[PDB]
PDB file of N, CA and C in Angstrom:
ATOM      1  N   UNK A   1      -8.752 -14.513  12.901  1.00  0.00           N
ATOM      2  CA  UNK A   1      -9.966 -13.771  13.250  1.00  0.00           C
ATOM      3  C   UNK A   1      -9.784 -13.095  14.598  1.00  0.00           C
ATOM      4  N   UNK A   2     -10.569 -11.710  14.776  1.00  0.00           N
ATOM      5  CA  UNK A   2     -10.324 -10.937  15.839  1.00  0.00           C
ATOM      6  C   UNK A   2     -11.728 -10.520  15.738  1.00  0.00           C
ATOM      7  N   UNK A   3     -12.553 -10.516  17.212  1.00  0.00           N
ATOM      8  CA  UNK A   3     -13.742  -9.981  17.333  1.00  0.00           C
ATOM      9  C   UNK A   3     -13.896  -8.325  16.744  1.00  0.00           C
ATOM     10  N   UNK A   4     -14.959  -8.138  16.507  1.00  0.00           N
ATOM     11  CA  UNK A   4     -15.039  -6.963  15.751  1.00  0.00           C
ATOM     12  C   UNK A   4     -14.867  -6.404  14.753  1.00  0.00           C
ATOM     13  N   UNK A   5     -14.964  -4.958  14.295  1.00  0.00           N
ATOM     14  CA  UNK A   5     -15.103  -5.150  13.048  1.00  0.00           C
ATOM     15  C   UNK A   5     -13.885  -4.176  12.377  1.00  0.00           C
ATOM     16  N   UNK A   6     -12.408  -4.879  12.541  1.00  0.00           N
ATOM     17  CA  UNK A   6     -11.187  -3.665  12.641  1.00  0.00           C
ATOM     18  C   UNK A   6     -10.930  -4.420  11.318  1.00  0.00           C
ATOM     19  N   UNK A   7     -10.654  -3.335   9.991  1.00  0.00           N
ATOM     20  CA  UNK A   7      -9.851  -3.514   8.891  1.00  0.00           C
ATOM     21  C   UNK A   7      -8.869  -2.483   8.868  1.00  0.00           C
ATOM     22  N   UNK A   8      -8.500  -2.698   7.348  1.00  0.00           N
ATOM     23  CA  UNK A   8      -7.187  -1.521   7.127  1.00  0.00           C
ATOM     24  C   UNK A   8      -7.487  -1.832   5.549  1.00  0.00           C
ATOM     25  N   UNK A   9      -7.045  -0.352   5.407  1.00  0.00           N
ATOM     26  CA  UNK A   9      -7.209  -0.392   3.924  1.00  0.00           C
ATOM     27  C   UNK A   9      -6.254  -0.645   3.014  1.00  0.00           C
ATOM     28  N   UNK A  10      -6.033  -1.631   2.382  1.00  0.00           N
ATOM     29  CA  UNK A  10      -5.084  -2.095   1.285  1.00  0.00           C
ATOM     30  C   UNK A  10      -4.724  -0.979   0.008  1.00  0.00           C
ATOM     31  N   UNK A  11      -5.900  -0.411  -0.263  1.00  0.00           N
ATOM     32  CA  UNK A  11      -5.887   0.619  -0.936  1.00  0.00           C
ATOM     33  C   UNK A  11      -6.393   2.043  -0.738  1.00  0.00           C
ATOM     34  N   UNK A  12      -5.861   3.122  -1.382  1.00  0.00           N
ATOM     35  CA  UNK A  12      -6.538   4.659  -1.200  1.00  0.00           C
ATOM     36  C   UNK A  12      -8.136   4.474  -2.368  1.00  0.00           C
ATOM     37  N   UNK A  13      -8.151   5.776  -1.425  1.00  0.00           N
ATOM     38  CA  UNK A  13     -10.343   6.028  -2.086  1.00  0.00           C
ATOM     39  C   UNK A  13      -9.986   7.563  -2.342  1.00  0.00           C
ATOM     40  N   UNK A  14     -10.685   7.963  -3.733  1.00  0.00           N
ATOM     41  CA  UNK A  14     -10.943   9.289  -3.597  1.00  0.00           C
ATOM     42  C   UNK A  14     -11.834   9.774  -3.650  1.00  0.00           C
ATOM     43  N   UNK A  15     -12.843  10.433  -2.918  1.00  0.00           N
ATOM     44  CA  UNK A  15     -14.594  10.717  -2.668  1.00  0.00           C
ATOM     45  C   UNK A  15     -15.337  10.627  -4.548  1.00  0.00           C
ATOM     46  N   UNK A  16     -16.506  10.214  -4.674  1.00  0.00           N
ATOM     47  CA  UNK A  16     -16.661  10.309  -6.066  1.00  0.00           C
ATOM     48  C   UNK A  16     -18.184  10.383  -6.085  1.00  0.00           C
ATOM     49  N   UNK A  17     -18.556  11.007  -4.969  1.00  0.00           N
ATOM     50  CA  UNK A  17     -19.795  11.026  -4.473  1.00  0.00           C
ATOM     51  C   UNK A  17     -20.741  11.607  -3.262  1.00  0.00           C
ATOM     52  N   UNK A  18     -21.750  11.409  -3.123  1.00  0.00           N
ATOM     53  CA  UNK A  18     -21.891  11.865  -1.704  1.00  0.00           C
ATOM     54  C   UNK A  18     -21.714  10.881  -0.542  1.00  0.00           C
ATOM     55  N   UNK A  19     -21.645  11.686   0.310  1.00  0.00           N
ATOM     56  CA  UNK A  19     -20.802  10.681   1.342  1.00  0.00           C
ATOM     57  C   UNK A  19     -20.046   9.531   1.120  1.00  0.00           C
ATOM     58  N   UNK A  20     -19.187   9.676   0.568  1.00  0.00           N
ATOM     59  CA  UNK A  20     -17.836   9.193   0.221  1.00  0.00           C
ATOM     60  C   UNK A  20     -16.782   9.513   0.692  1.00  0.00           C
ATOM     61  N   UNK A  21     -15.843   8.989   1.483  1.00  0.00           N
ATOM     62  CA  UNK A  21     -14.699   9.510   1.798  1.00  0.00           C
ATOM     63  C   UNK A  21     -13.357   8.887   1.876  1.00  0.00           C
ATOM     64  N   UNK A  22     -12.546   9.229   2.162  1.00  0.00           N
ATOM     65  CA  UNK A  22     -11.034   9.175   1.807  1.00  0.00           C
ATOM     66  C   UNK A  22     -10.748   8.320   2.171  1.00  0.00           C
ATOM     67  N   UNK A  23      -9.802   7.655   1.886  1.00  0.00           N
ATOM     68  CA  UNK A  23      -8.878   5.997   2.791  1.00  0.00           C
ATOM     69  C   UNK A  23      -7.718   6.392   2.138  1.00  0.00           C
ATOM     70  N   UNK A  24      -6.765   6.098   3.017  1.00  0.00           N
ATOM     71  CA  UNK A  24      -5.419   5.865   2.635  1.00  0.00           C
ATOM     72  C   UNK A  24      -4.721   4.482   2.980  1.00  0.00           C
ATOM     73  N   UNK A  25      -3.844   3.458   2.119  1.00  0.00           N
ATOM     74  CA  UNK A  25      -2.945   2.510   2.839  1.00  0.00           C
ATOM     75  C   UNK A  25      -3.132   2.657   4.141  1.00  0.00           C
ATOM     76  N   UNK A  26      -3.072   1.961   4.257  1.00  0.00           N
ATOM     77  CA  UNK A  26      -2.415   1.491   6.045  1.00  0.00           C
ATOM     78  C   UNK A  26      -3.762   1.905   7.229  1.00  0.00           C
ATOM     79  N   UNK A  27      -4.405   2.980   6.552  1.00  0.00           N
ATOM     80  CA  UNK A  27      -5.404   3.272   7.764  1.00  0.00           C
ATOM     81  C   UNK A  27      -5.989   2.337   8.676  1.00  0.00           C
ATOM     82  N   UNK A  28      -6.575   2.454   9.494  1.00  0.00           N
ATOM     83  CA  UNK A  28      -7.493   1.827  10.153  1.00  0.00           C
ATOM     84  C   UNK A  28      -8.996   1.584   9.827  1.00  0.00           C
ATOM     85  N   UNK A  29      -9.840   0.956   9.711  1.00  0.00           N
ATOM     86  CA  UNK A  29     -10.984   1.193   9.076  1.00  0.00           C
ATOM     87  C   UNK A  29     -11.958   0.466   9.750  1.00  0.00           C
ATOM     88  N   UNK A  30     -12.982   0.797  10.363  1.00  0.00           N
ATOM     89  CA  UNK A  30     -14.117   0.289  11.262  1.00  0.00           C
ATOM     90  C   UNK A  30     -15.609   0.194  10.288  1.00  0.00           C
ATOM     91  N   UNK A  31     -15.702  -1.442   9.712  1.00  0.00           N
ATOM     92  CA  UNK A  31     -16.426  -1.312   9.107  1.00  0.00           C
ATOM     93  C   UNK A  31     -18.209  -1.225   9.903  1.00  0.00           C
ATOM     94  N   UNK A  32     -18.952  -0.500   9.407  1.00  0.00           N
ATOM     95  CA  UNK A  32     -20.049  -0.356   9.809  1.00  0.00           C
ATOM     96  C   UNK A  32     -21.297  -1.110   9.315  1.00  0.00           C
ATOM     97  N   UNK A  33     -21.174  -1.071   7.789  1.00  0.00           N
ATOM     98  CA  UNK A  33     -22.913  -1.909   7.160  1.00  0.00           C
ATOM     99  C   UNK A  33     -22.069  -1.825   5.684  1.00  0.00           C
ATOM    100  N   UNK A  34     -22.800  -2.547   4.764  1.00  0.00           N
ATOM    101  CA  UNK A  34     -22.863  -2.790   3.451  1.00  0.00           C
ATOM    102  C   UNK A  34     -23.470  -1.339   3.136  1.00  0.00           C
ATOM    103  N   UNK A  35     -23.622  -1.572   1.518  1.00  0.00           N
ATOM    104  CA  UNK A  35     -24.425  -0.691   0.158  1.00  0.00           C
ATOM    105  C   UNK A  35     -24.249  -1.664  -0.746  1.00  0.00           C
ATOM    106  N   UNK A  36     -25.025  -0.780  -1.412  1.00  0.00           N
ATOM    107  CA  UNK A  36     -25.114  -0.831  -3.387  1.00  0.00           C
ATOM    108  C   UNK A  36     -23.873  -0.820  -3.842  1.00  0.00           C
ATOM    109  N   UNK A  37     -23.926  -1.326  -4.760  1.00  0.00           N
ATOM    110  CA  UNK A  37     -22.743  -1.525  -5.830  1.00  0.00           C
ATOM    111  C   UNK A  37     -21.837  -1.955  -5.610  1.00  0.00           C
ATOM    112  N   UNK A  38     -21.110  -2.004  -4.376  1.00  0.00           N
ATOM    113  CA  UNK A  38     -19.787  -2.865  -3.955  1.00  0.00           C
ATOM    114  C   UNK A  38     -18.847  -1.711  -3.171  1.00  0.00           C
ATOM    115  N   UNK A  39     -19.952  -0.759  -2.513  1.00  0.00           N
ATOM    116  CA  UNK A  39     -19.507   0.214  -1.665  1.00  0.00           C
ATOM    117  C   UNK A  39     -19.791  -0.356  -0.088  1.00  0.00           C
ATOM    118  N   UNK A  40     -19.264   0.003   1.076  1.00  0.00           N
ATOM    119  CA  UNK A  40     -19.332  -0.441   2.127  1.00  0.00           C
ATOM    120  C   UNK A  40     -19.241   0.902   2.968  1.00  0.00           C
ATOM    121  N   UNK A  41     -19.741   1.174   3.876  1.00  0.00           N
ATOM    122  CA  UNK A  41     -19.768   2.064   5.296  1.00  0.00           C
ATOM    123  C   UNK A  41     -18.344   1.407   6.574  1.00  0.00           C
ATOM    124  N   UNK A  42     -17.943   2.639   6.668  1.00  0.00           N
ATOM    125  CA  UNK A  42     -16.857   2.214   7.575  1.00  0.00           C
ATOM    126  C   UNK A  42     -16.480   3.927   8.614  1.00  0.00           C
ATOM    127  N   UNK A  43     -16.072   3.564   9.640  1.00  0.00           N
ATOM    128  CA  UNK A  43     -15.084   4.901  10.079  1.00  0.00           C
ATOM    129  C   UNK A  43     -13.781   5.260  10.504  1.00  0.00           C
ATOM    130  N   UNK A  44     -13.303   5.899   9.463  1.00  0.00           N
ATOM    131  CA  UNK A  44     -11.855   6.731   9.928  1.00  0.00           C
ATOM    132  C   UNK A  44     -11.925   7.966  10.310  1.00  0.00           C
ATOM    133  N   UNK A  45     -10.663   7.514  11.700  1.00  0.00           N
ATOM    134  CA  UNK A  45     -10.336   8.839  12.564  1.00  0.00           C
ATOM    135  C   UNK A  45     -11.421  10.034  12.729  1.00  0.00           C
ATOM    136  N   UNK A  46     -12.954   9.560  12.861  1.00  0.00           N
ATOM    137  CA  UNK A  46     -14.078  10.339  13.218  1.00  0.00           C
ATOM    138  C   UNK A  46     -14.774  10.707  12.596  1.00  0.00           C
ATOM    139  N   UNK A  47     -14.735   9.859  11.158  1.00  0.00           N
ATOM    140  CA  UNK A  47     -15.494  10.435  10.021  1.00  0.00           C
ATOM    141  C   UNK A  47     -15.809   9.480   9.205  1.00  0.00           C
ATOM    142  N   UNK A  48     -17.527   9.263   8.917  1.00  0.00           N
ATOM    143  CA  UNK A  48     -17.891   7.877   8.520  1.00  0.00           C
ATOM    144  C   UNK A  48     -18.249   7.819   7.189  1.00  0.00           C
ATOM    145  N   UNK A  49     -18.297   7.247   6.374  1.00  0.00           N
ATOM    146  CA  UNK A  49     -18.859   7.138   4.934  1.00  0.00           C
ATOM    147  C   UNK A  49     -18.373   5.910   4.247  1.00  0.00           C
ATOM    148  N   UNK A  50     -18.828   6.108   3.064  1.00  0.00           N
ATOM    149  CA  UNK A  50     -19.195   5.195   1.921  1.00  0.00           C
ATOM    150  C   UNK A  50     -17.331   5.425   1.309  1.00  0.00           C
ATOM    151  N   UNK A  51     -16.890   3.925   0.827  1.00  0.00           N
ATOM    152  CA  UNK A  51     -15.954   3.394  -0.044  1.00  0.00           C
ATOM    153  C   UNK A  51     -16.121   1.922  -0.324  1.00  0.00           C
ATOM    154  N   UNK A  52     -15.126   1.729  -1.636  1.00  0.00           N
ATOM    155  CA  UNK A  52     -15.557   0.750  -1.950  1.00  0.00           C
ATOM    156  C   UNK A  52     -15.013  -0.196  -1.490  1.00  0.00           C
ATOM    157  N   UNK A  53     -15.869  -1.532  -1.087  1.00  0.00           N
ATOM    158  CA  UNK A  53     -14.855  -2.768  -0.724  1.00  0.00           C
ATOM    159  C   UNK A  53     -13.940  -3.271  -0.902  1.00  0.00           C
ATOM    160  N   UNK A  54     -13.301  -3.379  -1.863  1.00  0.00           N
ATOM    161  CA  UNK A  54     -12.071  -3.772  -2.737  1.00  0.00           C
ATOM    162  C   UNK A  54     -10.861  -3.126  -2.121  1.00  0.00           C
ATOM    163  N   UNK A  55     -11.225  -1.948  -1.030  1.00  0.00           N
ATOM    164  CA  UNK A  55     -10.637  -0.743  -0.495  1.00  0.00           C
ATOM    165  C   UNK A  55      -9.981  -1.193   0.770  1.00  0.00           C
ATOM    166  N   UNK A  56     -10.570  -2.499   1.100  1.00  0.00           N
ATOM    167  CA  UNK A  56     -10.054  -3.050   2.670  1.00  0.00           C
ATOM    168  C   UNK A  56     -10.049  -4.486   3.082  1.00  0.00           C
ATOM    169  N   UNK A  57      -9.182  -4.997   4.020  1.00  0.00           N
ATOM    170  CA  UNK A  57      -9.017  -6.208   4.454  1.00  0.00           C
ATOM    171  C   UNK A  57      -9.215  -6.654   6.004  1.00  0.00           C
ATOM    172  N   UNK A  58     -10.147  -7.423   6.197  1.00  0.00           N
ATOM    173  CA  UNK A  58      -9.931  -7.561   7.981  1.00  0.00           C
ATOM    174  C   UNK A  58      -8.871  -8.091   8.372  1.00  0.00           C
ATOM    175  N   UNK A  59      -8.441  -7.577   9.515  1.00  0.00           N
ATOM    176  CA  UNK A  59      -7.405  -8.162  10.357  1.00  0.00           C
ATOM    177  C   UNK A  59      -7.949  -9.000  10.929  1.00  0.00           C
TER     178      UNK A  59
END
């Protein structure tokens, strides 16, 4: 465990919605709040939105 809220994404996202956005492997990912369905809020490199959980792992 590491204070805060730093993941990385295990897997890529491809938008399938509104505000939805991209993840690639390896990124960095700053999770922000939950959603519906098993989508989560996070931000990469300056740009925040909706993917799905399954999409990332905390460090």
């Amino acid at each position: 465990s590491v204070p805060g809220r730093k993941f990385i994404a295990v897997k890529a996202h491809s938008p399938q919605g509104e505000g939805e956005i991209p993840l690639h492997r390896g990124e960095a990912v700053k999770v922000l709040s939950i959603g519906e369905g098993g989508f989560w809020e996070g931000t990469v490199k300056g740009r925040t939105g909706w993917f799905p959980a399954d999409c990332v792992e905390e460090v």
